[PDB]
Amino acid sequence: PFTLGQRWISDTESELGLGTVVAVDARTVTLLFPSTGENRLYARSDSPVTRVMFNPGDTITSHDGWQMQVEEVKEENGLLTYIGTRLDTEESGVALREVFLDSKLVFSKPQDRLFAGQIDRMDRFALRYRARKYSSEQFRMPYSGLRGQRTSLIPHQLNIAHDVGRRHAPRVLLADEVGLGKTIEAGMILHQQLLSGAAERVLIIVPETLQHQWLVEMLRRFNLRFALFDDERYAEAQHDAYNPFDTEQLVICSLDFARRSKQRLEHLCEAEWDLLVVDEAHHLVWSEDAPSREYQAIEQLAEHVPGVLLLTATPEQLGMESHFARLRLLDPNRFHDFAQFVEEQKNYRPVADAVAMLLAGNKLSNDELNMLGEMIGEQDIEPLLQAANSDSEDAQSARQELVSMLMDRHGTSRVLFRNTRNGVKGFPKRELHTIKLPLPTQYQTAIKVSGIMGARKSAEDRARDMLYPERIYQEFEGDNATWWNFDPRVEWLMGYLTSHRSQKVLVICAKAATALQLEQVLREREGIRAAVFHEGMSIIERDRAAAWFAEEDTGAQVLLCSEIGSEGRNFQFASHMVMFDLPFNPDLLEQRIGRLDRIGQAHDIQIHVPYLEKTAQSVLVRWYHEGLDAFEHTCPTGRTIYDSVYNDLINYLASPDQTEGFDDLIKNCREQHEALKAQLEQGRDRLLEIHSNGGEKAQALAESIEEQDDDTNLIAFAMNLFDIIGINQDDRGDNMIVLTPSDHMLVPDFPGLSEDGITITFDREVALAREDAQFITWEHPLIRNGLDLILSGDTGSSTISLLKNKALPVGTLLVELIYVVEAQAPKQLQLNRFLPPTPVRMLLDKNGNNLAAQVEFETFNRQLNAVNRHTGSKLVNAVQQDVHAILQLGEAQIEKSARALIDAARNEADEKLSAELSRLEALRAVNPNIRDDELTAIESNRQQVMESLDQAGWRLDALRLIVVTHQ
């Protein structure tokens, strides 16, 4: 709704100051910033702009330097006109059009707000002081940026985020096993760099089929709204900007999209990204002599972007050698010769073996132990070397310090994280239950028709038909034929369901059609609550079913899934899974089990597989269980064996009558399975796996965060904030509030709110079951926004209150003073770790003696009550000459107090920031992956902070006058 002449500020670069609308097109608006004279042009969407308006009672300044007194404001044709009294001339009726406001933003001094008759509420003075205190403590939290995410507190994930999220320009390759949290680790790092101010622009490059998955994860899990950029978006933005990608900070797009034109890929590398994220980097095939035409586009990209996140897989049982092609992109100088990397890794292999011997309870030959000595290049290994091997009292500490020293020399573990399911504990066991049902005669006849008509069709598709009797019975008895009346699986299903009504059951089938038919029969014949869950539904629908399914004991008993989506939400309360059918390939099979076989579930998983006798299913049950052991264990051997046996195994599917030769296929498959399993365990880089999951120290970190999650001041603070803002908070009951606006709202529009309301929860476990709700923490944008609205504004800065105390003299003056110590620095410097805006309360007397250390804040405010507007007004002016003399009294004490905070902070800062620089120097002398850039940033940051801290000042933010009465 932009119309020429409106005033706006930049939410980020207010160091640019105020702006003025100077142009408008269909898609864009142009602001002039008179502070510098520069213009910045933005897209209306994502709108990181804040309205600049003033209220009656404010004192404002005109561009000619004179000021005035706000009395009334008109709006016409999208423009505001301020009407009031000119203060320097005492002329009434002066008008100031918003186009003539100054570029300079001044925050009013509360005494001039009190001198001029502005008295705010006494409950808003209370919130303002509480907010600066609460905000201050959370900024300095050691693990900031690791508490707001809607995830389980899994140590191995949290370790990588802490390690990588704190680096400068991080360039890492995430090769975690599938299902371990690559995208979670990715988002945490993103969540971290955005909160610390180190990054503002993020680019995730995703295959188009996965773009929506990433959009919802960053928005619902990490509170990050990415703008999807397609051709349509790209065309309208080329007209609107020099670089189309300057209109949005966070962008998803496809690599196929990225390679369309060269001018497009040039703009991307010139878009000045702080971080880059690339999913499925294994699709990048690279020959030293012949790089693909795609890899050249990334290598052109990877030369223009500081931070680079690579998500990849190392599938088909290959090693980290396949990763060299990508490692080449992070540090092309570090990785410059293939063969040398192979020799090093080959020479490292024996140590992993000997280490694997170590913790298993083995002795290590001296010749063996004299190969580890070459890796760790020192001379005093032996005393530490033998206790770990001699199995003395401290072999645990001799092992842990030995291994620790080994890790600092690993060639990739600093830049490469690959956690396996064997080096990570916490996953639940999976137990099987099989039920053999008699093949009804109606199908026998039904398959012979498909048999005959299956004259000319591949065994690949002939067996795909024999898989699902349901979908040819809808072709020969007409669609919707009542197959649900004689099939014993349904009879077994109900009986099992009606006998376990108090258990949440996950029921997975192939196609959505079968799920919808199943719901009707379970409902209209057993009164069973069953939600259908297919990809065709909207997110709101899937959220709705998760809610119903999450009701502890009053909701849906069953979740009917068809062709399930790929690793969506967590059903931590569900521990039972039923296979109405089994998919063909073993990868999808583990995916079904994947929605439950996750860290953080309630109990172990019980799997029930009712299968029809003598069908393709009966074949797949034994092969999956006896051959691959795919039900109780998760090893991804299935596809290789599935590919190496396909044409033989297929025929037993396309014709389950011929049973001989089968029983030998199974024992042959189990031989391959155990061998492949064995071969993989012996390829384990157990050092990389131990360094990746963070170990025991990480689990300690995980429990510290588990304790910050009981913050009751937050919940109580939040409501206060809200209620003041004027947000109705209906308590639905299950830790969820519905927030709605009001007629008495304080702002035109709040960033997150809609009139239809939003559901919120403060509990991490409820959040994991209801992703449609907001997981409320100290780091959620809602809180920082409302906080900035208050702490930037001057409401709560001036109020009056009376005190009724028999035990004090009449007419005494108490003045509650909230000074604010502040630094002016870009958020990249991270001053808030050591000196965020920190309140300094002071209760001075008529002689300037401070009582605040003795008089707690909350309790004093409790026993206070307000006055009426008129009497209090000039009651202030009775001592207006007195209080001004009271102020300078504190001026001499804050400078003493200020340096106290500053001095302690500079010690704590130089301590941690030098301790990190010393540690990083130790690795650079010992590891080749530490970059020059890394240490320089810390050094520059250490110097700049201590410099910016030597120039910090204080200011009086809030002021409450106290008058004692005995009335």
Side-chain angles (χ1 to χ4, degrees), residues 178-179 213 430 506 508 561 563-569 577 579 583 585-598 630 634:
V178 62
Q213 180 206 294
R430 319 191 317 204
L506 197 58
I508 307 174
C561 313
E563 179 44 75
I564 189 62
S566 290
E567 313 325 89
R569 52 201 84 214
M577 173 176 293
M579 302 292 196
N585 63 100
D587 280 325
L588 309 187
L589 183 273
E590 185 64 46
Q591 274 191 255
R592 295 181 176 186
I593 313 176
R595 301 294 294 247
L596 264 51
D597 176 60
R598 308 186 173 177
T634 182

PDB file of all heavy atoms in Angstrom, residues 178-179 213 430 506 508 561 563-569 577 579 583 585-598 630 634:
ATOM      1  N   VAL A 178      21.978 -41.684   6.429  1.00  0.00           N
ATOM      2  CA  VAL A 178      20.633 -41.211   6.124  1.00  0.00           C
ATOM      3  C   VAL A 178      19.750 -41.388   7.353  1.00  0.00           C
ATOM      4  O   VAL A 178      19.790 -42.424   8.029  1.00  0.00           O
ATOM      5  CB  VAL A 178      20.075 -41.938   4.889  1.00  0.00           C
ATOM      6  CG1 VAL A 178      19.972 -43.436   5.134  1.00  0.00           C
ATOM      7  CG2 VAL A 178      18.717 -41.370   4.497  1.00  0.00           C
ATOM      8  N   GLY A 179      18.978 -40.358   7.676  1.00  0.00           N
ATOM      9  CA  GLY A 179      18.145 -40.410   8.857  1.00  0.00           C
ATOM     10  C   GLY A 179      18.812 -39.977  10.141  1.00  0.00           C
ATOM     11  O   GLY A 179      18.216 -40.136  11.212  1.00  0.00           O
ATOM     12  N   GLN A 213      10.110 -29.595   0.953  1.00  0.00           N
ATOM     13  CA  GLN A 213      10.555 -30.198   2.205  1.00  0.00           C
ATOM     14  C   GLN A 213      11.458 -29.251   2.984  1.00  0.00           C
ATOM     15  O   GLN A 213      11.319 -29.112   4.205  1.00  0.00           O
ATOM     16  CB  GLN A 213      11.287 -31.507   1.909  1.00  0.00           C
ATOM     17  CG  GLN A 213      11.809 -32.237   3.133  1.00  0.00           C
ATOM     18  CD  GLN A 213      13.000 -33.121   2.806  1.00  0.00           C
ATOM     19  OE1 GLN A 213      12.881 -34.100   2.071  1.00  0.00           O
ATOM     20  NE2 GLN A 213      14.164 -32.757   3.331  1.00  0.00           N
ATOM     21  N   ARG A 430      13.715 -53.419  17.400  1.00  0.00           N
ATOM     22  CA  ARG A 430      12.556 -53.651  16.550  1.00  0.00           C
ATOM     23  C   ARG A 430      12.243 -55.134  16.618  1.00  0.00           C
ATOM     24  O   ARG A 430      13.093 -55.964  16.286  1.00  0.00           O
ATOM     25  CB  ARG A 430      12.832 -53.206  15.110  1.00  0.00           C
ATOM     26  CG  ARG A 430      13.602 -51.888  15.033  1.00  0.00           C
ATOM     27  CD  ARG A 430      13.666 -51.290  13.636  1.00  0.00           C
ATOM     28  NE  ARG A 430      13.950 -52.273  12.598  1.00  0.00           N
ATOM     29  CZ  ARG A 430      14.494 -51.973  11.423  1.00  0.00           C
ATOM     30  NH1 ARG A 430      14.830 -50.722  11.142  1.00  0.00           N
ATOM     31  NH2 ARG A 430      14.712 -52.929  10.532  1.00  0.00           N
ATOM     32  N   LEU A 506       0.391 -47.554  14.120  1.00  0.00           N
ATOM     33  CA  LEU A 506       0.682 -47.052  12.787  1.00  0.00           C
ATOM     34  C   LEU A 506       0.423 -48.151  11.764  1.00  0.00           C
ATOM     35  O   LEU A 506       1.075 -49.201  11.791  1.00  0.00           O
ATOM     36  CB  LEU A 506       2.135 -46.590  12.699  1.00  0.00           C
ATOM     37  CG  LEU A 506       2.431 -45.696  11.501  1.00  0.00           C
ATOM     38  CD1 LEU A 506       1.538 -44.499  11.551  1.00  0.00           C
ATOM     39  CD2 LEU A 506       3.890 -45.281  11.436  1.00  0.00           C
ATOM     40  N   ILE A 508       0.353 -48.958   7.777  1.00  0.00           N
ATOM     41  CA  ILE A 508       0.914 -48.472   6.523  1.00  0.00           C
ATOM     42  C   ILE A 508       0.450 -49.382   5.397  1.00  0.00           C
ATOM     43  O   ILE A 508       0.562 -50.610   5.495  1.00  0.00           O
ATOM     44  CB  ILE A 508       2.448 -48.402   6.589  1.00  0.00           C
ATOM     45  CG1 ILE A 508       2.879 -47.596   7.817  1.00  0.00           C
ATOM     46  CG2 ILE A 508       2.990 -47.764   5.325  1.00  0.00           C
ATOM     47  CD1 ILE A 508       4.373 -47.568   8.074  1.00  0.00           C
ATOM     48  N   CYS A 561      -1.487 -44.896   6.648  1.00  0.00           N
ATOM     49  CA  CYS A 561      -0.521 -44.234   5.788  1.00  0.00           C
ATOM     50  C   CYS A 561      -0.507 -44.973   4.459  1.00  0.00           C
ATOM     51  O   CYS A 561      -0.484 -46.206   4.424  1.00  0.00           O
ATOM     52  CB  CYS A 561       0.866 -44.263   6.425  1.00  0.00           C
ATOM     53  SG  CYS A 561       0.853 -43.781   8.161  1.00  0.00           S
ATOM     54  N   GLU A 563       1.860 -44.889   0.796  1.00  0.00           N
ATOM     55  CA  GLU A 563       3.052 -44.461   0.069  1.00  0.00           C
ATOM     56  C   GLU A 563       3.684 -43.282   0.797  1.00  0.00           C
ATOM     57  O   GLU A 563       3.749 -42.168   0.267  1.00  0.00           O
ATOM     58  CB  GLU A 563       2.707 -44.133  -1.392  1.00  0.00           C
ATOM     59  CG  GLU A 563       3.879 -43.656  -2.256  1.00  0.00           C
ATOM     60  CD  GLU A 563       5.135 -44.481  -2.034  1.00  0.00           C
ATOM     61  OE1 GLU A 563       5.193 -45.627  -2.529  1.00  0.00           O
ATOM     62  OE2 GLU A 563       6.064 -43.987  -1.361  1.00  0.00           O
ATOM     63  N   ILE A 564       4.091 -43.520   2.047  1.00  0.00           N
ATOM     64  CA  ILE A 564       4.262 -42.443   3.013  1.00  0.00           C
ATOM     65  C   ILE A 564       5.251 -41.413   2.469  1.00  0.00           C
ATOM     66  O   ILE A 564       6.154 -41.733   1.684  1.00  0.00           O
ATOM     67  CB  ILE A 564       4.702 -42.989   4.385  1.00  0.00           C
ATOM     68  CG1 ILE A 564       4.666 -41.883   5.445  1.00  0.00           C
ATOM     69  CG2 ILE A 564       6.085 -43.635   4.306  1.00  0.00           C
ATOM     70  CD1 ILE A 564       3.280 -41.312   5.670  1.00  0.00           C
ATOM     71  N   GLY A 565       5.073 -40.164   2.882  1.00  0.00           N
ATOM     72  CA  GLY A 565       6.086 -39.160   2.636  1.00  0.00           C
ATOM     73  C   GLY A 565       7.410 -39.547   3.265  1.00  0.00           C
ATOM     74  O   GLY A 565       7.523 -40.465   4.078  1.00  0.00           O
ATOM     75  N   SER A 566       8.435 -38.799   2.887  1.00  0.00           N
ATOM     76  CA  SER A 566       9.817 -39.120   3.231  1.00  0.00           C
ATOM     77  C   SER A 566      10.237 -38.363   4.486  1.00  0.00           C
ATOM     78  O   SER A 566      10.620 -37.192   4.426  1.00  0.00           O
ATOM     79  CB  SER A 566      10.748 -38.825   2.057  1.00  0.00           C
ATOM     80  OG  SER A 566      10.532 -39.746   0.999  1.00  0.00           O
ATOM     81  N   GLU A 567      10.147 -39.055   5.625  1.00  0.00           N
ATOM     82  CA  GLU A 567      10.750 -38.629   6.888  1.00  0.00           C
ATOM     83  C   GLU A 567      10.236 -37.249   7.312  1.00  0.00           C
ATOM     84  O   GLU A 567      10.961 -36.252   7.375  1.00  0.00           O
ATOM     85  CB  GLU A 567      12.277 -38.659   6.767  1.00  0.00           C
ATOM     86  CG  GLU A 567      12.846 -39.942   6.131  1.00  0.00           C
ATOM     87  CD  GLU A 567      12.062 -41.207   6.475  1.00  0.00           C
ATOM     88  OE1 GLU A 567      11.102 -41.541   5.742  1.00  0.00           O
ATOM     89  OE2 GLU A 567      12.415 -41.876   7.469  1.00  0.00           O
ATOM     90  N   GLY A 568       8.936 -37.237   7.604  1.00  0.00           N
ATOM     91  CA  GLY A 568       8.254 -36.062   8.109  1.00  0.00           C
ATOM     92  C   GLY A 568       8.232 -35.917   9.621  1.00  0.00           C
ATOM     93  O   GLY A 568       9.293 -35.888  10.252  1.00  0.00           O
ATOM     94  N   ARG A 569       7.044 -35.829  10.218  1.00  0.00           N
ATOM     95  CA  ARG A 569       6.931 -35.531  11.640  1.00  0.00           C
ATOM     96  C   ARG A 569       7.140 -36.768  12.521  1.00  0.00           C
ATOM     97  O   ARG A 569       7.100 -37.915  12.065  1.00  0.00           O
ATOM     98  CB  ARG A 569       5.569 -34.892  11.921  1.00  0.00           C
ATOM     99  CG  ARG A 569       4.388 -35.683  11.381  1.00  0.00           C
ATOM    100  CD  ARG A 569       3.175 -34.784  11.221  1.00  0.00           C
ATOM    101  NE  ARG A 569       3.221 -34.074   9.944  1.00  0.00           N
ATOM    102  CZ  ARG A 569       2.758 -32.844   9.748  1.00  0.00           C
ATOM    103  NH1 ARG A 569       2.220 -32.166  10.755  1.00  0.00           N
ATOM    104  NH2 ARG A 569       2.850 -32.282   8.549  1.00  0.00           N
ATOM    105  N   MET A 577       3.518 -50.851  14.822  1.00  0.00           N
ATOM    106  CA  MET A 577       3.402 -50.677  13.383  1.00  0.00           C
ATOM    107  C   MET A 577       2.821 -51.953  12.793  1.00  0.00           C
ATOM    108  O   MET A 577       3.218 -53.053  13.174  1.00  0.00           O
ATOM    109  CB  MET A 577       4.756 -50.369  12.747  1.00  0.00           C
ATOM    110  CG  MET A 577       4.728 -50.342  11.224  1.00  0.00           C
ATOM    111  SD  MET A 577       6.442 -49.828  10.465  1.00  0.00           S
ATOM    112  CE  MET A 577       6.441 -47.995  11.096  1.00  0.00           C
ATOM    113  N   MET A 579       2.036 -53.872   9.073  1.00  0.00           N
ATOM    114  CA  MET A 579       2.234 -53.884   7.639  1.00  0.00           C
ATOM    115  C   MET A 579       1.083 -54.569   6.929  1.00  0.00           C
ATOM    116  O   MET A 579       1.062 -55.797   6.801  1.00  0.00           O
ATOM    117  CB  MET A 579       3.544 -54.599   7.289  1.00  0.00           C
ATOM    118  CG  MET A 579       4.787 -53.994   7.919  1.00  0.00           C
ATOM    119  SD  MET A 579       5.201 -52.234   7.188  1.00  0.00           S
ATOM    120  CE  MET A 579       7.037 -52.074   7.830  1.00  0.00           C
ATOM    121  N   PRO A 583       6.460 -53.162   0.771  1.00  0.00           N
ATOM    122  CA  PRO A 583       6.862 -52.608  -0.515  1.00  0.00           C
ATOM    123  C   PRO A 583       7.817 -53.575  -1.188  1.00  0.00           C
ATOM    124  O   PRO A 583       8.285 -54.551  -0.598  1.00  0.00           O
ATOM    125  CB  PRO A 583       7.546 -51.297  -0.134  1.00  0.00           C
ATOM    126  CG  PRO A 583       8.151 -51.604   1.200  1.00  0.00           C
ATOM    127  CD  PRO A 583       7.181 -52.534   1.893  1.00  0.00           C
ATOM    128  N   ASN A 585      10.950 -52.738  -2.833  1.00  0.00           N
ATOM    129  CA  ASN A 585      12.366 -52.554  -2.565  1.00  0.00           C
ATOM    130  C   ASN A 585      12.611 -52.305  -1.078  1.00  0.00           C
ATOM    131  O   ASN A 585      11.749 -51.757  -0.379  1.00  0.00           O
ATOM    132  CB  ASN A 585      12.912 -51.390  -3.386  1.00  0.00           C
ATOM    133  CG  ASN A 585      12.272 -50.071  -3.023  1.00  0.00           C
ATOM    134  OD1 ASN A 585      12.848 -49.271  -2.285  1.00  0.00           O
ATOM    135  ND2 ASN A 585      11.067 -49.840  -3.531  1.00  0.00           N
ATOM    136  N   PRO A 586      13.777 -52.704  -0.559  1.00  0.00           N
ATOM    137  CA  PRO A 586      14.006 -52.607   0.891  1.00  0.00           C
ATOM    138  C   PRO A 586      14.264 -51.196   1.396  1.00  0.00           C
ATOM    139  O   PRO A 586      14.194 -50.976   2.612  1.00  0.00           O
ATOM    140  CB  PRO A 586      15.240 -53.502   1.112  1.00  0.00           C
ATOM    141  CG  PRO A 586      15.433 -54.265  -0.186  1.00  0.00           C
ATOM    142  CD  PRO A 586      14.882 -53.388  -1.252  1.00  0.00           C
ATOM    143  N   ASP A 587      14.540 -50.231   0.515  1.00  0.00           N
ATOM    144  CA  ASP A 587      14.765 -48.865   0.977  1.00  0.00           C
ATOM    145  C   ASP A 587      13.477 -48.229   1.488  1.00  0.00           C
ATOM    146  O   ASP A 587      13.473 -47.577   2.538  1.00  0.00           O
ATOM    147  CB  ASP A 587      15.378 -48.039  -0.154  1.00  0.00           C
ATOM    148  CG  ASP A 587      16.872 -48.282  -0.308  1.00  0.00           C
ATOM    149  OD1 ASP A 587      17.548 -48.487   0.721  1.00  0.00           O
ATOM    150  OD2 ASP A 587      17.371 -48.285  -1.456  1.00  0.00           O
ATOM    151  N   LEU A 588      12.378 -48.402   0.752  1.00  0.00           N
ATOM    152  CA  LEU A 588      11.083 -47.903   1.204  1.00  0.00           C
ATOM    153  C   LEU A 588      10.622 -48.623   2.465  1.00  0.00           C
ATOM    154  O   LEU A 588       9.956 -48.029   3.320  1.00  0.00           O
ATOM    155  CB  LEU A 588      10.040 -48.038   0.091  1.00  0.00           C
ATOM    156  CG  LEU A 588      10.404 -47.479  -1.288  1.00  0.00           C
ATOM    157  CD1 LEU A 588       9.205 -47.532  -2.236  1.00  0.00           C
ATOM    158  CD2 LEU A 588      10.957 -46.067  -1.186  1.00  0.00           C
ATOM    159  N   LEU A 589      10.967 -49.905   2.586  1.00  0.00           N
ATOM    160  CA  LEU A 589      10.623 -50.681   3.774  1.00  0.00           C
ATOM    161  C   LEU A 589      11.216 -50.051   5.026  1.00  0.00           C
ATOM    162  O   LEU A 589      10.526 -49.887   6.038  1.00  0.00           O
ATOM    163  CB  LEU A 589      11.102 -52.125   3.602  1.00  0.00           C
ATOM    164  CG  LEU A 589      10.799 -53.175   4.675  1.00  0.00           C
ATOM    165  CD1 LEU A 589      11.867 -53.189   5.758  1.00  0.00           C
ATOM    166  CD2 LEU A 589       9.415 -52.956   5.274  1.00  0.00           C
ATOM    167  N   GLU A 590      12.495 -49.683   4.977  1.00  0.00           N
ATOM    168  CA  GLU A 590      13.105 -49.035   6.131  1.00  0.00           C
ATOM    169  C   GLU A 590      12.540 -47.634   6.328  1.00  0.00           C
ATOM    170  O   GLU A 590      12.543 -47.116   7.450  1.00  0.00           O
ATOM    171  CB  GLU A 590      14.623 -48.987   5.971  1.00  0.00           C
ATOM    172  CG  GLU A 590      15.348 -48.441   7.182  1.00  0.00           C
ATOM    173  CD  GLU A 590      15.170 -49.336   8.388  1.00  0.00           C
ATOM    174  OE1 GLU A 590      15.317 -50.567   8.236  1.00  0.00           O
ATOM    175  OE2 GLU A 590      14.872 -48.817   9.484  1.00  0.00           O
ATOM    176  N   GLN A 591      12.048 -47.011   5.257  1.00  0.00           N
ATOM    177  CA  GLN A 591      11.438 -45.694   5.388  1.00  0.00           C
ATOM    178  C   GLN A 591      10.150 -45.774   6.197  1.00  0.00           C
ATOM    179  O   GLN A 591       9.901 -44.919   7.054  1.00  0.00           O
ATOM    180  CB  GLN A 591      11.162 -45.095   4.012  1.00  0.00           C
ATOM    181  CG  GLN A 591      12.328 -44.342   3.408  1.00  0.00           C
ATOM    182  CD  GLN A 591      11.923 -43.550   2.184  1.00  0.00           C
ATOM    183  OE1 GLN A 591      12.230 -43.931   1.053  1.00  0.00           O
ATOM    184  NE2 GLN A 591      11.234 -42.438   2.404  1.00  0.00           N
ATOM    185  N   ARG A 592       9.298 -46.761   5.907  1.00  0.00           N
ATOM    186  CA  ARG A 592       8.093 -46.943   6.707  1.00  0.00           C
ATOM    187  C   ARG A 592       8.449 -47.047   8.181  1.00  0.00           C
ATOM    188  O   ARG A 592       7.943 -46.289   9.016  1.00  0.00           O
ATOM    189  CB  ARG A 592       7.332 -48.195   6.267  1.00  0.00           C
ATOM    190  CG  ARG A 592       6.762 -48.189   4.863  1.00  0.00           C
ATOM    191  CD  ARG A 592       6.030 -49.502   4.621  1.00  0.00           C
ATOM    192  NE  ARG A 592       5.355 -49.551   3.327  1.00  0.00           N
ATOM    193  CZ  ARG A 592       4.554 -50.540   2.943  1.00  0.00           C
ATOM    194  NH1 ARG A 592       4.328 -51.564   3.755  1.00  0.00           N
ATOM    195  NH2 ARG A 592       3.977 -50.506   1.748  1.00  0.00           N
ATOM    196  N   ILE A 593       9.339 -47.988   8.512  1.00  0.00           N
ATOM    197  CA  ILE A 593       9.838 -48.136   9.871  1.00  0.00           C
ATOM    198  C   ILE A 593      10.540 -46.866  10.330  1.00  0.00           C
ATOM    199  O   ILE A 593      10.692 -46.638  11.533  1.00  0.00           O
ATOM    200  CB  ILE A 593      10.776 -49.365   9.943  1.00  0.00           C
ATOM    201  CG1 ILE A 593      10.124 -50.564   9.250  1.00  0.00           C
ATOM    202  CG2 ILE A 593      11.128 -49.713  11.386  1.00  0.00           C
ATOM    203  CD1 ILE A 593      10.991 -51.806   9.173  1.00  0.00           C
ATOM    204  N   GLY A 594      10.956 -46.020   9.388  1.00  0.00           N
ATOM    205  CA  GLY A 594      11.703 -44.829   9.750  1.00  0.00           C
ATOM    206  C   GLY A 594      10.904 -43.819  10.549  1.00  0.00           C
ATOM    207  O   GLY A 594      11.446 -43.165  11.443  1.00  0.00           O
ATOM    208  N   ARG A 595       9.614 -43.658  10.235  1.00  0.00           N
ATOM    209  CA  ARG A 595       8.805 -42.682  10.962  1.00  0.00           C
ATOM    210  C   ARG A 595       8.738 -42.975  12.453  1.00  0.00           C
ATOM    211  O   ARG A 595       8.476 -42.060  13.245  1.00  0.00           O
ATOM    212  CB  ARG A 595       7.386 -42.637  10.390  1.00  0.00           C
ATOM    213  CG  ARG A 595       7.305 -42.282   8.909  1.00  0.00           C
ATOM    214  CD  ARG A 595       7.765 -40.859   8.644  1.00  0.00           C
ATOM    215  NE  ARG A 595       6.884 -39.868   9.251  1.00  0.00           N
ATOM    216  CZ  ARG A 595       6.129 -39.020   8.559  1.00  0.00           C
ATOM    217  NH1 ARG A 595       6.144 -39.044   7.231  1.00  0.00           N
ATOM    218  NH2 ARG A 595       5.357 -38.146   9.189  1.00  0.00           N
ATOM    219  N   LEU A 596       8.976 -44.224  12.850  1.00  0.00           N
ATOM    220  CA  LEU A 596       8.994 -44.635  14.248  1.00  0.00           C
ATOM    221  C   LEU A 596      10.380 -44.967  14.769  1.00  0.00           C
ATOM    222  O   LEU A 596      10.711 -44.594  15.892  1.00  0.00           O
ATOM    223  CB  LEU A 596       8.068 -45.836  14.468  1.00  0.00           C
ATOM    224  CG  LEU A 596       6.661 -45.504  14.968  1.00  0.00           C
ATOM    225  CD1 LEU A 596       6.003 -44.444  14.110  1.00  0.00           C
ATOM    226  CD2 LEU A 596       5.811 -46.766  15.025  1.00  0.00           C
ATOM    227  N   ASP A 597      11.216 -45.652  13.990  1.00  0.00           N
ATOM    228  CA  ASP A 597      12.540 -46.036  14.477  1.00  0.00           C
ATOM    229  C   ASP A 597      13.402 -44.773  14.476  1.00  0.00           C
ATOM    230  O   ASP A 597      14.230 -44.538  13.594  1.00  0.00           O
ATOM    231  CB  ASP A 597      13.130 -47.148  13.613  1.00  0.00           C
ATOM    232  CG  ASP A 597      14.546 -47.523  14.017  1.00  0.00           C
ATOM    233  OD1 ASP A 597      14.742 -47.947  15.175  1.00  0.00           O
ATOM    234  OD2 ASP A 597      15.459 -47.410  13.175  1.00  0.00           O
ATOM    235  N   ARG A 598      13.179 -43.935  15.490  1.00  0.00           N
ATOM    236  CA  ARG A 598      13.901 -42.682  15.669  1.00  0.00           C
ATOM    237  C   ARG A 598      14.299 -42.505  17.127  1.00  0.00           C
ATOM    238  O   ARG A 598      13.679 -43.063  18.036  1.00  0.00           O
ATOM    239  CB  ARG A 598      13.081 -41.459  15.237  1.00  0.00           C
ATOM    240  CG  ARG A 598      12.476 -41.521  13.860  1.00  0.00           C
ATOM    241  CD  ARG A 598      11.839 -40.186  13.553  1.00  0.00           C
ATOM    242  NE  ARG A 598      11.359 -40.073  12.183  1.00  0.00           N
ATOM    243  CZ  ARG A 598      10.715 -39.011  11.711  1.00  0.00           C
ATOM    244  NH1 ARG A 598      10.475 -37.974  12.504  1.00  0.00           N
ATOM    245  NH2 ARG A 598      10.315 -38.980  10.447  1.00  0.00           N
ATOM    246  N   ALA A 630      15.482 -57.473   7.872  1.00  0.00           N
ATOM    247  CA  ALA A 630      15.171 -56.074   7.596  1.00  0.00           C
ATOM    248  C   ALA A 630      14.162 -55.505   8.579  1.00  0.00           C
ATOM    249  O   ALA A 630      14.026 -54.281   8.676  1.00  0.00           O
ATOM    250  CB  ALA A 630      14.647 -55.923   6.166  1.00  0.00           C
ATOM    251  N   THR A 634      18.357 -52.534  10.713  1.00  0.00           N
ATOM    252  CA  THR A 634      18.186 -51.493   9.706  1.00  0.00           C
ATOM    253  C   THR A 634      19.294 -51.430   8.662  1.00  0.00           C
ATOM    254  O   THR A 634      19.296 -50.495   7.855  1.00  0.00           O
ATOM    255  CB  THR A 634      18.069 -50.129  10.383  1.00  0.00           C
ATOM    256  OG1 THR A 634      17.854 -49.114   9.393  1.00  0.00           O
ATOM    257  CG2 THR A 634      19.342 -49.835  11.119  1.00  0.00           C
TER     258      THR A 634
END
